[PDB]
Design a protein around this ligand. Structure first.
Ligand SMILES: [Mg+2]
Ligand SMILES: [Mg+2]
Ligand SMILES: [Mg+2]
Lengths: 345, 345, 69, 207
DNA sequence: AAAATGTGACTTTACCCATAACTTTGCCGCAACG
DNA sequence: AAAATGTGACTTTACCCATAACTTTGCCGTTACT
């Protein structure tokens, strides 16, 4: 499309005006920080300023993209800046539709513009950003899943499953260093400067706008939490509510009429020692079994541990096939021997 | 706090209010609005008041539907007191009276007292609101209320419950395998054998497995400890045993003293203190024991046992083969099987 | 006939001390709840009250299958 | 028979179609009709077709949703046959094996035979299709399967089950009363007394 | 005379995916009236 | 060598009547603007 007249800019006239949210699956393998077993490949969420091509915030998770994978990048952006873009643009579908994302946006007077069905030309800048990220950082990492594009050529000598040594924390540090220091200072060919310099100039022209300042307190943290697919849970006796195979407990569950009742839940994906439930018309904190084991730890590693444990639980749920196979082999010879011993008698 | 008092559907309704108001707060009202003028005016006025007082207008749009509702009791207070007394002194008793008879007695007492009698639904609803430790202990006893026990949830991090390292906390437990065993020479019914387990509570690993027909005594502990020393080389640092008389003896205590073994004693009728090995007994039952001829599963309800399905006439296994296959299970199948709370075998 | 046993359980027998009701769950029995230490009834009085129930309590009670006592 | 093939939801939908078409059948069509013209015309045409070649035209407005669906089995036939055989010969057996172990054995056999292995949910769902008397008798025994045995439902007037008059059919049965008794004099426990009941089947009166 | 051990293998709802099967409904022609 | 007995007492939903504690509306008074 060609812009004959001078309409509203597609990139913006000042920073933070349009924040494009996009997602990519890294061509890399990640192992546990305590065992070394290959978890898999992660998902990164990039929030890029359309005006300055600056990566304001990033989010790392092992899950497929959805509203929880962008509320996280929004809260990270608020953590590092304290303001939200007035036009936070997200994707269409059902994984990006919820009732807490839009409530968060309506709290701070923000506007949401979803993509049209199967048309990403509005966020076409994110496509080149993903290409640059893959061809500048991702493909330059040991054990990158570059040969996985040709499954027929994936030999055990060059298999990234037994090659990559990258971990969630170390690769997170490397990704942040590449995105916020190398990319943020490297000149972009679009506007002909570095993203940081363009952002500084745009903020100088547009001021600070202190009315959009948000205090990064605990209330905001609860304001930016996702919810499981069902949205409710059953209160078991003495145990609590199950979220991602973890039982979160609150003393409010001791009420006789709340037992085994369906209660609305919310889960923090940056720490798994704390969730929230709705009891007696009040949101109440629920403590898991990972709270004592992670009491006294800063928030800069709680999220790493939580994501790693989530992926570990998913892989354990996947291990049931091998468990059943071994049980079947053992039981087969039990039967064999049993039949032989009966025939002997 | 006002926000945190609301519910998810309150969030949705306040969001609907916000999307109704926002076009009016942008100078571009819609040409087709279902909401009338007065309602949108009220919502806009509340938005303005909230944005002019609390610094955030969305809080004005909250409904807080939990605050509305008739939380007042409808029965007279004398009836409530008399029904509470009857529940306390005629239903929570060591008689297990049915609800109908105690309700009838309550109604007769009410009719003598001249107070308004309640309905059977009222009695059932107030009995299901007093459920818990008190009811189960004043009805069936302490061993039945033990299922309705409050768990222990760690706020701070004491010494870990299952172990900081292997061979730190190890559990001893006996049981009788639900399988009828036959003799290897004369082929008569030898009854059900007894299996004793020594489990490393950290990795839940079966350190030692022993099987013998005799009732548990110091001989079983002797054999299990000798097996544990033979297979690995060292006894567990803290041996956790139950209050059985075979552990409160003179041989076991001096045996543990000789090898610098801290002996821990779980309180009587509190099996949760051995939640690792005891659950592993059920794992053995479902994975190896209950898949064998003569599995005394039907005998749980002896009313359904027939001479054709009595396991005694079906018994085929001997002691040696059952022990050797249970050892094969313990040291290879459960050994290599991945664990939930361990993320590896 | 057989269900008339169960009614005798609910209306007369399970509402007495020392009833053998909690022994269905043998795994949950303690010396403080054993009916052999709580029992106080005798054969004569138990028979007398069972006859009373069967002859003037259940006898005058309306039946669902007859719409009459 | 078409009416007998209808559901209450299908009946309500037919009622809605009739209420939509009724103004068009009286010369007073409404000026506010949300339903498009093509559907109204099709409903009217089928109304006339039914009133012509059936006898009543309402019966031409029946949906019969029950026929719709994909009942074709999605698993390969060899997979079926193997899983039938394993459910027959490794689950309903005098072992009371759990479903996970039998599914694992079936999966191992399928991988030996080079066929598709059904998921665990499929195994549980088909096992749930075999419930009743046969499975309970082939797993627990004839005593346990007796609950789901059968009810003999009277078609004609045979001799009544519970007699015709008092003192016609009386049942005799004994039981062990669930009550402990102490000795009258010495106070020692004596056990649980036995109760013998003779009761007529007509008036239920404990004889 | 006295505080601190639930647990994990197995099974079951729930959401998505593909296809069969009846009903909708805009896009076009065709007969009838002004 | 073989027909042809499930009950019913004691619970648990499920719907209706009453009232609290607010949202949801119309309607009229008031006021800025033309
Ligand atoms: Mg034991
Ligand atoms: Mg047992
Ligand atoms: Mg009895």
């Amino acid at each position: 499309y060609w812009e004959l007249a001078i309409t509203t800019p597609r990139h913006g006239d000042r920073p933070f005006e349009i924040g494009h949210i996009a997602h990519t699956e890294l061509d890399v393998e990640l192992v546990c920080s305590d065992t070394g077993r290959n978890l898999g490949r992660p998902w990164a969420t990039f929030l890029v300023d359309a005006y300055s091509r600056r990566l304001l915030a990033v989010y790392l998770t092992f899950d497929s993209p959805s509203y929880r994978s962008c509320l996280m990048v929004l809260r990270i952006c608020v953590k590092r800046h304290g303001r939200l873009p007035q036009i936070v643009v997200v994707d269409n579908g059902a994984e990006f539709h919820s009732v807490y994302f839009e409530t968060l946006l309506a709290t701070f007077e923000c506007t949401k513009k979803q993509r049209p069905p199967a048309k990403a030309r509005f966020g076409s800048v994110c496509e080149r950003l993903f290409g640059t990220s893959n061809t500048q950082f991702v493909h330059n990492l040991l054990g990158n899943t570059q040969i996985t594009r040709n499954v027929r050529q994936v030999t055990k000598s060059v298999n990234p499953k037994n090659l990559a040594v990258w971990t969630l924390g170390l690769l997170y540090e490397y990704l942040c260093a590449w995105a916020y220091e190398v990319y943020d200072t490297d000149e972009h060919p679009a506007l002909f400067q570095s993203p940081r310099d363009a952002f500084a100039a745009g903020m100088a022209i547009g001021g600070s706008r202190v009315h959009r300042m948000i205090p990064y307190d605990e209330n905001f943290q609860i304001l930016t939490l996702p919810t499981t697919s069902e949205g409710k849970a059953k209160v078991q006796v003495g145990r609590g509510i199950k979220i991602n195979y973890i039982y979160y407990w609150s003393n409010s569950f001791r009420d006789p009429q709340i037992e085994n009742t369906s209660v609305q839940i919310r889960y923090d994906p940056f720490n798994i020692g704390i969730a929230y439930a709705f009891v007696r018309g009040q949101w109440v904190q629920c403590i898991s079994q990972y709270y004592a084991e992670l009491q006294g730890r800063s928030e800069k590693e709680l999220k790493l541990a939580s994501i790693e444990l989530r992926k570990h639980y998913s892989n354990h749920t996947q291990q049931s096939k091998v468990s059943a196979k071994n049980l079947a082999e053992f039981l087969a010879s039990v039967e064999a021997q049993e039949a032989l011993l009966e025939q002997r008698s | 706090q006002r926000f945190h008092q609301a519910s998810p559907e309150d969030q949705a309704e306040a969001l609907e209010r916000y999307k109704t108001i926002e076009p009016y707060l942008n100078g571009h009202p819609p040409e087709n609005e279902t909401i009338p003028a007065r309602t949108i005016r009220h919502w806009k006025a509340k938005y303005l008041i909230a944005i002019q007082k609390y610094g955030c207008g969305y809080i004005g749009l909250l409904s807080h539907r939990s605050v509305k509702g008739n939380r007042q009791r409808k029965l007279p207070e004398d009836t409530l007191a008399i029904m509470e007394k009857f529940i306390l002194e005629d239903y929570e008793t060591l008689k297990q009276k049915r609800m109908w008879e105690v309700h009838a007695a309550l109604v007769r007492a009410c009719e003598e007292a001249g107070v308004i009698a309640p309905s059977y639904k009222a009695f059932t609803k107030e009995v299901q609101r007093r459920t818990g430790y008190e009811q189960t202990k004043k009805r069936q006893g302490r061993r039945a209320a033990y299922q309705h026990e409050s768990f222990y949830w760690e706020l701070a991090i004491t010494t870990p419950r299952h172990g900081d390292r292997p061979f730190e906390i190890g559990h001893i437990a006996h049981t009788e395998l639900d399988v009828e065993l036959v003799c290897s020479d004369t082929g008569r019914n030898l009854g059900r054998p007894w299996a004793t387990f020594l489990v490393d509570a950290y990795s839940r690993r079966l350190l030692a497995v022993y099987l013998t027909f005799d009732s548990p005594s110091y001989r079983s502990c002797l054999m299990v400890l000798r097996i544990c020393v033979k297979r690995h080389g060292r006894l567990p640092q803290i041996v956790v045993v139950d209050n059985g008389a075979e552990f409160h003896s003179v041989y076991f205590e001096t045996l543990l003293a000789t090898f610098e073994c801290t002996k821990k004693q779980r309180p009587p009728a509190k099996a949760r203190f051995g939640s690792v090995c005891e659950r592993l007994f059920g794992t053995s039952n479902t994975q190896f024991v209950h898949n064998l001829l003569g599995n005394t599963q039907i005998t749980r309800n002896v009313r359904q046992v027939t001479k054709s399905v009595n396991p005694k006439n079906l018994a085929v296994w001997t002691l040696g083969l059952l022990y050797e296959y249970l050892c094969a299970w313990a040291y290879e199948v459960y050994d290599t099987d991945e664990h939930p709370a361990l993320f590896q075998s």
